[PDB]
């Protein structure tokens, strides 16, 4: 019968920092992590900036020997997972290793590695494809490599639900624990889609901001002058743990995960419906799961991608779910600062939602100069808002019309 | 307490046929689906054969327009899903669409599309990349396009656990139903990795059979002369349905899904441990989930990839779990005939496991001319074996040491 799930550790790489506290400092100061991309030449691309991880040192985590075989998205996911496990104080033993699993996902996985191996195949033939190509690129290898390195023998899997991946990964891992399949899960996501195919592919869709001349102002969720999402890289990982298991070892508990919701829009492969009907069904599912009155929601970390249709669909969903209470809660998009980490977006934003609870502060939506038609909620424009937060909601929406919602609340 | 889950519809593309009954006829007749790959210069490659889908007609399912937008692995996953839903007789309505979800996975997803868009990018720069590249390639678009086409609004997600994907997809879909989030799930996987990058990537790891002279004899699980797996394409989809929901509409019920187990080896990135300790924990977990004693198992659909290390680990795991019953059950690898459909393997093998129950027959392990050292179990060498099958297991073991086991039982 259903057990309670708490957050005992968190880990992050973001455009704002190489761990959680440095990233969070940036979030509260309204700092942008968006900058012209340096790691390749983008003059032929319509978008030439993004949220890069700056000065990532893989030798903090892994031998250069192991690191050379692994796509950046895996290195990022391992870095966040190691931070989270360390942060939790958990010790893996013969007695508990069968009860500790991992669910680290990605939307696009090792696209850089695939691209580089395609260049080898085309220029030099199949004999120049790396022996490590497959195991070094495929999305489940964060879960695989973490399990091997720490000896985790519990449920081992990976989700890929595009921009919903991080949220789904954390929610479903919570279900493993809640219904007895595990006592501990490392869950979240990682992404490094900043290669020609990624920047080119999203550019071909006309889905990215093309504000090349002012990249820090590009991500402007709900602003009347928004022109698409900013592509960003990184990872979030949380250690989820059964409550009595956490209490028994004297674990520090950041917050409790009380609700998870899933729904499909069944509308369009890439566009959300204008009324946010699927997002609304998903949040209602999460709130019922948490046994909450919707008026208990204090803070929503929006998906808030800075797309014309996405941002307005979220306002409509929130008004539909919360009615007049929509005007009392605070909703912000931290993508205003971080840009869109795709399959890692829900993971880093779940962490920001837990830290909004710990610190009693709504992070800002930066660049919200001229709220668009109907964007008349408290969107925490420009500056962090200290306020009472008992219950925090994190939303994600993705290609295929796939929605996820997490509900966190303070733990007493 | 927990709801019961039954199988009411199945769908498939495999190297043996363009649907379930044609595929199953091939299996019971010991037919091989393996042949030299066509319309592709494989001169430079060490492996020039595999399990192709032959004569697939996507316009039975999709318009020309919508098929041009979707990688083959998506076309395949949609063909199996449409088949399964048609086979179930289910009627989608406004009253039930919120209770119907999708979990169709893939190990690698749209490699063919990635290869073709790489060519455009390298030859002509980013502006020639298809606008539909991303949504036409990413792994969650079978779940996405299926939900949009049929108006399915329930849980929408996608697993990617390499060669375990199809087993995990069905087991986790079964949990959605058992725990009351959905009444129906379409679940399974699809794969089309037979492009240069696929054949080249596995080839560079030297994980494929190079028996180019005798392709139909290449896949030979537990045979002393095996030299790695055979790469195959296709899809499996099952309609999973809550028992009372199926009975209330007079659904034909093929079998009951009674058990799902997961585990991680936490051993190696690509090889299982010698003793199959991980596969053994996973089978014990699935049997405990089903409330069944090992003695009650009659038939096992092995992973049985034809790798030196993998085949012998599964013998060790079955002897460990089953002890004095290990010789009385029948265990066969249908990969002897289909080859290895990677993320779709667990999907088509769950279907073969359900049909072994329906028809009371253990499919053969073909090419098993000379069992290897300690491969002395009933491996159903050469020809199908009619027998009592009340309980059937389907195992998958993948890169990352990720393990899944499904337990099916006869329904009355
Ligand atoms: C568009 C499609 C993809 C893609 C497709 C399949 C995948 C994947 C990435 O990495 C895993 O195998 N990335 N961008
Ligand atoms: C693995 C997944 C689940 C699951 C799935 C869906 C659910 C749920 C539990 O509780 C409410 O909706 N349990 N074990």
């Amino acid at each position: 019968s259903r057990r309670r799930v708490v957050i005992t550790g968190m880990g992050m790489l973001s455009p704002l920092g190489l761990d959680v506290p440095s990233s969070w400092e940036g979030i509260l100061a309204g700092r942008s992590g968006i900058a012209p991309i340096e790691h390749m030449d983008l003059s032929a691309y319509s978008t030439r900036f993004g949220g890069s991880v700056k000065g990532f040192n893989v030798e903090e985590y892994l031998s250069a020997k192991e690191a050379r075989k692994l796509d950046l998205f895996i290195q990022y996911g391992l870095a966040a997972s190691f931070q989270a496990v360390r942060d939790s104080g958990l010790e893996v033993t013969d007695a508990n290793r069968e009860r500790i699993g991992v669910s680290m996902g990605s939307g696009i996985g090792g696209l850089t590695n695939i691209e580089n191996n395609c260049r080898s195949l085309f220029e030099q033939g199949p004999r120049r494809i790396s022996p490590f190509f497959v195991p070094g690129s495929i999305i489940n290898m964060v879960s695989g490599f973490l399990s091997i390195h720490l000896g985790l023998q519990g449920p081992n899997y990976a989700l890929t639900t595009a921009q919903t991946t991080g949220t789904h990964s954390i929610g479903m891992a919570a279900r493993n624990i809640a219904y007895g399949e595990a006592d501990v899960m490392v869950a979240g996501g990682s992404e490094m889609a900043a290669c020609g195919l990624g920047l080119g592919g999203f550019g071909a869709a006309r889905a990215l901001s093309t504000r090349n001349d002012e990249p820090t102002r590009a991500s402007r969720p709900w602003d009347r002058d928004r022109d698409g999402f900013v592509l960003s890289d990184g990872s979030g990982a949380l250690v989820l743990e059964e409550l009595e298991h956490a209490r028994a070892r004297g674990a520090r508990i950041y917050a409790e995960l009380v609700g998870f919701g899933m729904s499909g829009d069944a509308f369009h492969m890439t566009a959300p419906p204008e009324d946010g009907a699927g997002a609304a069904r998903c949040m209602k599912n999460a709130l019922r799961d948490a046994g909450l009155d919707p008026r208990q929601v204090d803070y929503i970390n929006a998906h808030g991608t800075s797309t014309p249709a996405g941002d307005i669909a979220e306002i409509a969903a929130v008004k539909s779910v919360f009615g007049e209470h929509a005007h009392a809660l605070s909703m912000s998009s931290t993508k205003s600062m971080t840009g869109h980490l795709l399959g890692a977006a829900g993971a880093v934003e779940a962490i920001f939602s837990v830290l909004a609870l710990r610190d009693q502060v709504a992070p800002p939506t930066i660049n919200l100069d001229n709220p668009d038609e109907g964007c008349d909620l408290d969107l925490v424009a420009h500056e962090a808002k200290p306020r009472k937060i008992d219950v925090a909601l994190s939303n994600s929406f993705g290609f295929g019309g796939t929605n996820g919602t997490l509900v966190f609340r303070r733990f007493a």
Side-chain angles (χ1 to χ4, degrees), chain A residues 37-366:
Chain A
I37 288 177
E38 288 169 355
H39 44 84
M40 46 183 359
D41 154 22
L42 295 171
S43 11
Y45 295 70
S46 46
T47 305
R48 303 192 275 272
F49 58 93
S52 291
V53 176
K54 286 151 288 268
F56 175 55
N57 178 195
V58 67
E59 282 219 79
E60 267 304 343
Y61 300 100
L62 298 168
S63 54
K65 214 233 184 199
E66 299 286 58
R68 45 170 241 106
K69 306 181 186 154
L70 305 174
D71 192 273
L72 284 179
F73 94 91
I74 295 161
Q75 301 183 16
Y76 291 173
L78 289 177
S81 296
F82 286 139
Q83 291 185 21
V85 162
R86 162 169 294 176
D87 184 39
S88 73
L90 193 71
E91 316 201 70
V92 184
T93 61
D94 281 14
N96 68 11
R97 71 177 68 259
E98 290 178 29
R99 303 290 303 157
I100 311 163
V102 46
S103 188
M104 287 292 293
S106 181
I108 283 160
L111 195 53
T112 299
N113 225 357
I114 292 159
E115 186 169 307
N116 287 340
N117 279 274
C118 210
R119 192 178 283 286
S120 298
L121 176 51
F122 287 169
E123 296 187 346
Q124 306 163 332
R127 296 175 190 101
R128 293 307 297 284
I129 296 163
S130 175
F132 300 111
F133 165 48
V134 176
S137 306
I138 62 175
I139 286 169
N140 68 305
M141 294 310 291
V142 180
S143 289
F145 281 102
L146 186 70
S147 81
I148 293 167
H149 267 247
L150 297 182
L152 314 183
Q153 291 183 348
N156 194 301
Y157 65 101
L159 305 198
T160 184
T161 56
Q163 305 95 332
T164 314
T165 296
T167 298
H168 281 169
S169 294
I170 293 167
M172 291 195 198
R175 298 287 207 249
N176 297 126
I177 297 171
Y179 298 96
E181 285 138 35
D183 296 329
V184 187
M185 290 295 287
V186 185
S190 64
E191 208 79 65
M192 202 296 175
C195 59
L197 273 178
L199 287 151
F202 283 123
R206 305 167 70 71
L208 293 177
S209 178
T210 58
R211 198 181 295 274
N212 297 303
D213 294 321
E214 249 178 343
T216 65
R217 300 189 61 215
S219 192
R220 55 196 310 107
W222 301 294
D223 183 86
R224 61 158 209 236
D225 294 315
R226 66 193 181 280
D227 71 323
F229 80 91
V230 177
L231 181 63
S232 289
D233 318 332
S235 52
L238 292 75
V239 172
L240 283 61
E241 186 166 357
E242 193 275 332
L243 176 51
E244 297 314 322
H245 192 279
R247 279 173 164 161
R249 67 173 187 98
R252 175 269 331 271
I253 296 167
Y254 287 107
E256 190 179 347
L257 181 41
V258 283
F260 171 55
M262 303 179 72
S263 77
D265 293 341
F267 173 53
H268 187 275
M269 288 206 290
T270 58
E274 310 178 15
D275 69 351
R281 281 191 304 265
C282 186
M283 286 187 270
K284 298 198 195 218
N285 284 345
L287 288 174
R288 286 197 298 267
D289 194 45
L292 297 174
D293 184 337
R295 298 176 294 177
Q296 292 176 259
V297 173
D298 291 325
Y299 175 61
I300 304 176
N301 189 281
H303 197 45
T305 59
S306 209
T307 67
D311 294 2
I312 192 63
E314 284 192 79
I315 305 290
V318 165
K319 283 179 165 179
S320 168
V321 169
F322 293 100
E324 284 308 317
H325 181 73
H327 293 291
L329 59 79
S330 296
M331 188 164 56
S332 66
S333 168
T334 46
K335 289 189 185 56
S336 69
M337 296 170 274
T338 61
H340 193 341
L341 280 83
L342 302 184
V348 299
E349 292 153 17
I351 292 167
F352 298 153
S353 298
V354 170
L355 298 171
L357 288 169
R358 188 189 65 198
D359 293 352
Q360 298 294 287
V361 64
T365 308
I366 67 170

